[PDB]
Amino acid sequence: KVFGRCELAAAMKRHGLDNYRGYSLGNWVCAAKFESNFNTQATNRNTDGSTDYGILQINSRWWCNDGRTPGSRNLCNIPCSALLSSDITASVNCAKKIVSDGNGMNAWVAWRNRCKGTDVQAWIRGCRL
Ligand SMILES: [Cl-]
């Protein structure tokens, strides 16, 4: 599923990501855009053999189990494939744990490099939220 911008915004708000850990909704939509281009089926292979999954490109090195990342962790206790569902509940729940581990949204490189410092509010502008 490829979300619409406001559609995703609505779904994320519904799941309580708006201002979660102080990150206003625009941050999350901004991150989703550059990580996955709003596509839940997005995957990307990393150098070390791990793989990023889903709309927020959550990595199997720590956060989910894909059965091919040896010595890794599964801190969100989920199969990585679950992060590819059209329903973003799993991704959101897992993201909440990630953003809480102490490094905030800097955990997403695309956010840090492309969203941090910019007018993230622009990403939910026009949306009926
Ligand atoms: Cl991540």
Swiss-Prot record:
Pfam families: Lys. Residues 1-129 form the C-type lysozyme domain. In the egg white and polymorphonuclear leukocytes. It catalyses: Hydrolysis of (1->4)-beta-linkages between N-acetylmuramic acid and N-acetyl-D-glucosamine residues in a peptidoglycan and between N-acetyl-D-glucosamine residues in chitodextrins. Its main location: secreted. Keywords: Allergen, Antimicrobial, Bacteriolytic enzyme, Disulfide bond, Glycosidase, Hydrolase, Secreted, Signal. It is an enzyme of class 3 (hydrolase). The active site is at E35, D52. It is found in: Secreted. GO terms for biological process: cell wall macromolecule catabolic process; defense response to bacterium; defense response to Gram-negative bacterium; defense response to Gram-positive bacterium; killing of cells of another organism. Disulfide bonds join C6-C127, C30-C115, C64-C80, C76-C94. SMART domains: LYZ1. GO terms for cellular component: cytoplasm; endoplasmic reticulum; extracellular space. Lysozymes have primarily a bacteriolytic function; those in tissues and body fluids are associated with the monocyte-macrophage system and enhance the activity of immunoagents. Has bacteriolytic activity against M.luteus. Lysozyme C is capable of both hydrolysis and transglycosylation; it also shows a slight esterase activity. It acts rapidly on both peptide-substituted and unsubstituted peptidoglycan, and slowly on chitin oligosaccharides. PANTHER family: LYSOZYME C. This is Lysozyme C. It comes from Gallus gallus (Chicken).
